[PDB]
Design a protein around this ligand. Structure first.
Ligand SMILES: [Zn+2]
Length: 166
């Protein structure tokens, strides 16, 4: 990944119309403050459609910052925070943000360092049922109950798109 992180941050902040996709995947020396800055910048950015920070050694502070962003941003379509060190608290914050977001259609939280746990999984399933705009959720539920409810929620949301198309 040869992405210029600082330049990318600047473009997000300036709402550069040519920046539709941000991929910071596998860049392992990005300071958390910089990732936090990207999240803050996205609050007012209207052109970035995809934001990915897979394997960036991100943690809860970054997840919470992105959760705040999701409640304000109404243009980002896909957020990927896979393979990081976000805890169940950080992940729950991201999913909870969906209660007040109708733009995001894809949220990938899969493969953090630690497991979420049944209690977090159950709350997530509940949240996915309260949001009707998300179409893809990147995560493999360990528990059957939450797994089926989430599978059904995503199927329902996708059916909505089909019924309202054109
Ligand atoms: Zn998984």
């Amino acid at each position: 990944n040869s992405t210029d992180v600082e330049e990318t941050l600047k473009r997000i902040q300036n709402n550069d119309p040519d920046l539709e996709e941000v991929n910071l995947n596998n860049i392992m020396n990005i300071p958390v403050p910089t990732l936090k800055a990207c999240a803050e910048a996205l609050k007012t950015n209207t052109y970035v459609k995809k934001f990915s920070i897979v394997g960036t050694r991100s943690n809860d502070p970054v997840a919470f910052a992105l959760a705040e962003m999701l409640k304000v941003n109404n243009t980002l379509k896909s957020l990927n925070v896979e393979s990081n060190f976000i805890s169940g608290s950080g992940i729950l914050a991201l999913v909870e943000a969906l209660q007040s977001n109708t733009s995001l259609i894809e949220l990938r939280i899969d493969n953090q360092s630690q497991p979420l746990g049944n209690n977090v999984e159950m709350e997530i399933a509940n949240m996915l049922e309260k949001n009707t705009t998300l179409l893809k959720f990147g995560y493999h539920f360990t528990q059957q109950g939450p797994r089926l409810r989430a599978s059904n929620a995503m199927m329902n949301n996708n059916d909505l798109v089909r019924k309202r198309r054109l």
